[PDB]
Design a binder for this molecule. Structure first.
Ligand SMILES: NC(=O)c1ccc[n+]([C@@H]2O[C@H](COP(=O)([O-])OP(=O)(O)OC[C@H]3O[C@@H](n4cnc5c(N)ncnc54)[C@H](O)[C@@H]3O)[C@@H](O)[C@H]2O)c1
Ligand SMILES: NC(=O)c1ccc[n+]([C@@H]2O[C@H](COP(=O)([O-])OP(=O)(O)OC[C@H]3O[C@@H](n4cnc5c(N)ncnc54)[C@H](O)[C@@H]3O)[C@@H](O)[C@H]2O)c1
Ligand SMILES: NC(=O)c1ccc[n+]([C@@H]2O[C@H](COP(=O)([O-])OP(=O)(O)OC[C@H]3O[C@@H](n4cnc5c(N)ncnc54)[C@H](O)[C@@H]3O)[C@@H](O)[C@H]2O)c1
Ligand SMILES: NC(=O)c1ccc[n+]([C@@H]2O[C@H](COP(=O)([O-])OP(=O)(O)OC[C@H]3O[C@@H](n4cnc5c(N)ncnc54)[C@H](O)[C@@H]3O)[C@@H](O)[C@H]2O)c1
Lengths: 342, 340, 340, 341
């Protein structure tokens, strides 16, 4: 039957990467894109990418007056800062991919529904009161009554699969997460006033290690309810343009033999071909650039310390392309979500 | 009595200017205006990723409506439109305009309307106002100049060098290429650029980025004898600060034009404040924080004989686009104060 | 029967060449020699920081004395001296010399002594052997030439562009500046450089570093009509790969020399494999992994009339110093194989 | 009396930074420098530094044929890869600062003593059989009978003060350390064969997050005997040229009130003006470049989780300039060690 109609709000890093994957989807049709700039700018950003490859080498991208044309397919372009002004209704838009970073609450995203959209997927955490989905961990909780959902954050899609497998193997008592994270667009190019008042994100991104807060651990309860309230964590932003790593320091309680090898073997048993991969090579961050795993466990860094009485302090580490890993996960979730539309 | 000075735009240039003006006995920094709160401004002043840790030698404390630096209290305003600033009631003499949003005489007039007596713009600002490179043309300044430009970083590097070369062997024409540190007008990662520049939209720290520059084309404002003789462009590269200017000039002379005679002339033209002379194998991080507006690099001079008195010449000089420019702008401001 | 090929030096160029030769039906990679063990060599082939994850599409496994790629077994040697290699008995036809330590006909002769029939050096290597830029002068090759040079990355960028300019409007003289990615001959942090270069001793990733280059001086080897007309130098900047060449030439012509007529000439000389033509606003990361030896950037062309048929002209082209060079060298090797 | 005669073996990052500090110490005299290069190369590296500032702006440095002259004072230069060939004895060298990275054992460093030097301070870990010193943590165990000592590693000088204060406040059961570390000279500029066979240090330093092993946590027992065997850890090398941070994830046992505030207040009580500083501003790595603290506790990053029954999992974080923080600690140790000559 008819392909599901998809609009993208915000043609940024995530939006353009989701475009690369949705545009090839036979079961979908990208009808419109909205941003804050003209078609030639959007076409050039789509064509050339500093970290994720030269898209123009395999595709023809051409800008029109009010549209872009990719491989013959014409997509209309809008420039509306307020979603209420978007014509989602006349375009019969089924799903809005909300990737602006400016509609991150169920109340804000509701504007898309008011404009005539049927469903909205927010490409970020967007509160404690909406469905937060990590594909292949809890995407099956989605129902027809969910109109606005969150695809969580890049760190949550990396932490969740790993935390779940560990917890299933040896119950987690508590854990502290540290993510060593590529710099992103919400940091400054050089020291300058940050619009949100964050004094550390105001510092030059490419020449600093920058401590930053993250809510990925504290909000793990939305994705893995048995871990609700057990994890806290934070981030260090460092000078790589993409590619990140999550380190979890957990206290686990178990009667089993808890060793580096038994830990690694459980992680390997929990791996799957789409979301959670298993690695034993000495890779570094540039090797995971562009991968489609949401999370890649690194068996080479597993550490274990026996505290006695069935208690252990354990370190498990996994890699993620904060751009493309998240995007591939968000896209899988979108493809599943579409069943509730058509 | 000390001259009352306000800073509009507490950015890279405004904060570096502050470091130097704050110590000037002949001036008093009365106010700062930007688009953020006092705590943000105090933190940016205390810690700098490329120009050093200012909090190590100074006390900076944020208040509700001010900052206090070394005991001295400075008022802080948050007005995007200069007409709303109380320059008149603060009896401000000179406004340092460092926002990048008032770069024309008509736009800068707002500061004077608000009650200031003089404005110095920290950028090129049209062809119709005094454009000043200290120790090249600052003496054209008169009492009737209310709004002036301190030109650009690249112009403050090129002018001393081009002038000295031209005085030695007249330039027929020249092409400038500047290898330039990335700046705040480029994006941290690939994204939509607000002014529609497709190259500036690219990630700053992992790309060589060609970009346009008007420094060579507008050199006539500073060195009238070179008017219309130079063109040029830029390459932005991944260093946070520190830049180099390469001039490829065809010169005509009956003299002996060699790498040595060229270098000896550059040295003869050097002076202790603006235009320095280097013969060491330095690299860009070595000039970070220097106070020369321009540092000629004798190690890179090249000369080719075209015959019949014509030569093609490459001369190179270094500049800290942040602090070299600032030191020049501050010299100009101190001179400008005589008219207040 | 397929041509038997050995690689000496499994570095940036050696591994990138492997990537292109391994799929060639007319070739068979028989051996690899370096200064490390098979596991080290296998990991480097698998994962590359700037040229992509090779392990995503290929199977690479290290053995005790070999590596196996996609089922094919390749012997590995660890011999610092080329005389100790068993080239003769493995019946190696062509040796790809990519170590950087055999950069002369006399040194490269060792490979022939060890029993190989032909040697291609991945660098400039003297005046006493053929220096080849594919699609510029590769056709001078004969069967009686046993050792050839594939020139330098910069030469492979400069030559096609200089040739096209010169054919259009003869060059009187020129000065070249290349803005170049840092490479393995620079230090990771400031430290003693073994070859005594005071600038290559400085940290590669946080500096603009002037350095000398012989590409312009030796253009005569590839384009004899330009012999002695060009000089040049380089600026190493903090990108791991991707470079650009700027040529500032004085040209003499009776024709209409404009940015447009220059660009149109370049487009006319472009071709599908070696010399490409660009009019998009690209930056250096866009040309990573490209297979052109040279990509002319029409957006940066500049021209100044000096009067009397003289013009000063700026033409610019891009090149991936690693893979652009490699693609040219692989084209040269494949042509060279006809003589085997 | 006579100034202590000091020789520097290895004019690298640490040797040159140490020179800057020692050269001004009146109680010392830098008599010789040995490396693998000529005076011209050494003089330029001392004048200009990509991360630690332009030294020539404040000093005159001039190269001769076999010497350098800094502010008028002439210093002899040697090029001897084997320490046995150095004329330490005839120059009456008291202390050798061993900063090459090639004499990191009591047995290798003994070569300097054989050459006629009286004492050696190695700028790295160098075994379990010699004194390993973190200033203001255990430097007072030094005796006149100690001829060869280790100044430990940069990470150890950051970890030791923090772990000690934590342990003194609430005893550590076990801990895992992660250090986010500036790239260093033992990584490659671009992907290439690493001489020591480390497949990760073989990768380009400035464009990768690179996992690496470290023995700092594992060997903390040499400096803090009560923590022996309780800590393990590793590192992530990232693309900043200098400036590092250490994260310690410790399980502690206590009957006291263990909170982020009680932890931070304990850390502050343990701070001192020279070695262990206390921070509450939102700094990032470039702010600590060139600082002289060996360790700078970051109170803004403290985390605590209650496990019940007196157990807590805690995160404490400290900053350090892996180059100049370590050098400053090593120089304080050298100045103290001089009492025994
Ligand atoms: N980049 C990452 O690593 C990453 C990973 C996971 C989730 N996210 C989340 O995805 C969202 C976007 O991330 P990003 O890195 O792509 O940022 P981005 O800056 O690259 O993209 C934002 C885009 O949205 C447009 N935009 C902004 N406000 C708008 C409005 N009111 N109306 C229409 N368009 C608007 C901007 O022009 C820009 O093109 C954020 O919520 C971010 O937190 C980012
Ligand atoms: N950074 C350099 O290398 C350099 C060198 C020479 C000249 N300049 C010029 O100096 C000016 C400032 O440059 P910068 O590098 O410091 O940029 P910047 O982004 O670091 O600083 C600009 C500051 O002005 C403030 N601002 C912006 N709009 C404003 C408004 N309407 N009202 C009040 N404040 C406002 C911003 O908050 C910011 O703090 C620009 O015109 C620039 O071209 C810069
Ligand atoms: N990297 C570039 O941008 C580039 C471009 C064009 C041409 N080249 C030239 O290609 C050559 C190799 O360059 P590279 O970038 O690959 O350097 P590289 O350091 O990455 O690789 C050189 C390889 O040769 C090996 N080697 C060194 N000495 C040896 C010996 N005695 N015997 C056997 N093997 C030895 C090394 O182990 C290393 O693997 C150089 O001459 C260089 O100038 C380099
Ligand atoms: N750089 C740091 O962050 C750091 C921090 C703490 C401890 N260290 C330790 O200090 C030591 C030196 O470190 P670095 O950063 O200065 O490295 P470096 O490469 O910058 O310095 C090494 C110097 O020693 C010289 N050298 C090498 N072998 C020699 C020999 N046989 N004889 C004489 N001179 C020789 C080299 O020419 C070079 O100048 C190492 O043990 C290192 O682990 C380094």
């Amino acid at each position: 039957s008819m392909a599901v109609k998809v609009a993208i709000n915000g043609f940024g890093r995530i939006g353009r990467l989701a475009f690369r994957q949705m545009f090839g989807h036979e079961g979908s049709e990208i009808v419109a894109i909205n941003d804050l700039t003209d078609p030639k700018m959007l076409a050039n950003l789509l064509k050339y990418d500093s970290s994720q490859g030269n898209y123009a080498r395999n595709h023809s991208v051409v800008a029109g007056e009010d549209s872009i044309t990719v491989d013959g397919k014409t997509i209309k372009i809008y420039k509306e800062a307020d979603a209420h002004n978007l014509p989602w209704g006349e375009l019969n838009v089924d799903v809005v991919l909300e990737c602006t970073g400016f509609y991150t609450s169920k109340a804000k995203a509701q504007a898309h529904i008011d404009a005539g959209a049927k469903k909205v997927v927010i490409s970020a955490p967007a509160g404690k009161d909406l469905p937060t989905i990590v594909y292949n961990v809890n995407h099956e909780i989605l129902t027809k009554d969910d109109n606005i959902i969150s695809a969580a954050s890049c760190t949550t899609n990396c932490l969740a699969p790993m935390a779940k497998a560990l917890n299933d193997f040896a119950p987690i008592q508590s854990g502290i997460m540290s993510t060593i994270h590529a710099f992103t667009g919400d940091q400054m190019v050089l020291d300058g006033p940050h619009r949100k008042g964050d004094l550390r994100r105001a510092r030059a991104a490419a020449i600093n290690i920058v401590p930053n807060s993250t809510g990925a651990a504290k909000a793990i309860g939305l994705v893995i309810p048995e871990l609700n309230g057990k994890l806290i964590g934070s981030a260090q932003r460092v000078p790589v343009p993409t590619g990140s790593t999550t380190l979890l320091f957990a206290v686990v309680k178990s009667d089993k033999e808890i060793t580096v090898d038994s830990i690694n073997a459980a992680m390997k048993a929990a791996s799957d071909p789409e979301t959670f991969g298993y690695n034993e090579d000495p890779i570094v961050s540039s090797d995971i650039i562009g991968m489609t795993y949401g999370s890649l466990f690194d068996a080479t860094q597993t550490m274990v310390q026996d505290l006695g009485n069935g208690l252990y302090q354990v370190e498990v580490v996994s890699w993620y392309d904060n751009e493309n890993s998240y995007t591939s996960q968000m896209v899988r979730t979108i493809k599943y979500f579409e069943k509730f539309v058509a």
